[PDB]
Amino acid sequence: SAISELHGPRLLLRAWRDSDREAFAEMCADPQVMEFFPSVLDRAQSDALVDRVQAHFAERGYGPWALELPGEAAFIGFTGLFDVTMDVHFAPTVEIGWRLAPAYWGRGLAREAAETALDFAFERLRLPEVVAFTTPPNRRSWGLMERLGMRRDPAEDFDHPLLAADHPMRRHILYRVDAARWAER
């Protein structure tokens, strides 16, 4: 396979390692990290998530990269691209998502990771568009989407189809950025 690593000024976006699973599990168990998600995850659930990531990298050659901070930390979380195949109005497409350990918030690291992942999406993969979705309360998350230059149509708000019809977290907002908008920043 030989999954290609992506480099920013500060960040290394790399394939996941066994050593990552411990660090990622405490992130998944952190109520500040998982605040706008349905719940925190146990070790088994966190490992399942990593298995899905590795399987995504095996099939597609890209995925949510593990974020390394050379000269500081081996693992501060993930940022990158996931294929959207679920039954939503904007499928099929590619989504960008991110999760940082709280110690690394407020540093522009999610921004830098996301810019590196989108550079890849538009320059190497040459995708027409990348989406991002989150819940309205998760201001840190859609705050990053709009600072990245992604734009929301409130009319494109949707109920996540892999949650229950009456799930309290069901309502998601959609941000989009196309090759043209990304190149124009």
Given 108, 128, 136, 161, the residue binding ligand COA (CB under 6 A): 108
Residue nearest to ligand COA (CB): 108
Segment interacting with ligand COA, rule: CB under 6 A, options 13-21, 41-49, 86-94, 103-111: 103-111
Closest to ligand COA by CB, 24 or 98: 98
Segment interacting with ligand COA, rule: CB under 6 A, options 18-26, 53-61, 134-142, 176-184: 134-142
Binding residues for CoA: 98-100, 106, 138, 143-145
Given 105, 119, 124, 180, the residue binding ligand COA (CB under 6 A): 105
- In three-state form (DSSP H/G/I as H, E/B as E, the rest C), the secondary structure along the chain is CCCCCEECCCCEEECCCCCHHHHHHHHHCCCCCCCCCCCCCCHHHHHHHHHHHHHHHHHHCCCEEEEEECCCEEEEEEEEEEEECCCCCCCCEEEEEEEECHHHCCCCHHHHHHHHHHHHHHHHCCCCEEEEEECCCCHHHHHHHHHCCCEECHHHCEECCCCCCCCCCCEEEEEEEEHHHHHHC
Alpha-carbon gap, residue 61 to 70, rounded angstroms: 23
Segment interacting with ligand COA, rule: CB under 6 A, options 15-23, 100-108, 149-157, 159-167: 100-108
145 touches ligand COA by CB under 6 A: no
Binding mask 20-59 for ligand COA (x = CB under 6 A): -------------x--x-----------------------
176 touches ligand COA by CB under 6 A: no
Q: Is the dihedral of CA 80, 117, 130, 154 positive or negative?
A: positive
Given 16, 57, 62, 98, the residue binding ligand COA (CB under 6 A): 98
